[PDB]
């Protein structure tokens with residue numbers, strides 16, 4: 001419940017909604033696949049991912065650094081490559097979602113590094129506090 005984790009999560013939620021979800025024709029990736037339009041989806045894809053699941057994860061503060069966040073963004077691209085193939089319009093769009101995500105992280109690199117560094121410090125400060133109690 002530290003202010004650095006709250007600020008970091010807030011930044012990630014903003015990148016998702018304001019930049020990634022704003023990618024033209026990205027709407028099929030904004031929510032989990034609807035099994036009606038794609039009956040064999042969950043047979044083919046073992047680990048499904050979408051922009052809504054990521055926002056729910058951000059809300060639960062799953063991501064303490066941009067790397068675990070990147071693992072879930074990259075899983076969206078790899079799922080599209082497997083299910084629709086590399087030539088698919090769905091994969092080209094998934095790739096564009098990934099490119100804008102990396103671009104926004106690059107643009108906010110110093111802010112994010114500082115927050116990641118502060119989240120790390122708060123966790124270490126919490127453990128030394130639980131040792132001074134005796």
Ligand SMILES: Cc1cc2c(-c3cncc(CO)c3)cnc(NC3CCN(CCCN)CC3)c2[nH]c1=O
Pocket residue numbers: 027031
């Ligand atoms: C069939 C379809 C759905 C859809 C859904 C959608 C689909 N399923 C569920 C839900 C709700 O939970 C939403 C969401 N946004 C769409 N497109 C808009 C078009 C205008 N864009 C801005 C352009 C600015 N000049 C932003 C995206 C969609 N376009 C579609 O063709």
Ligand SMILES: Cc1cc2c(-c3cncc(CO)c3)cnc(NC3CCN(CCCN)CC3)c2[nH]c1=O
Pocket residue numbers: 028029032033034035037038040044080083084088090
């Ligand atoms: C995210 C996604 C959606 C999608 C939707 C779709 C569109 N509107 C709404 C909804 C509701 O979720 C889904 C429809 N057809 C897709 N692509 C085809 C499916 C058949 N494939 C052959 C596989 C044979 N084993 C070739 C590519 C989709 N592929 C996707 O990756």
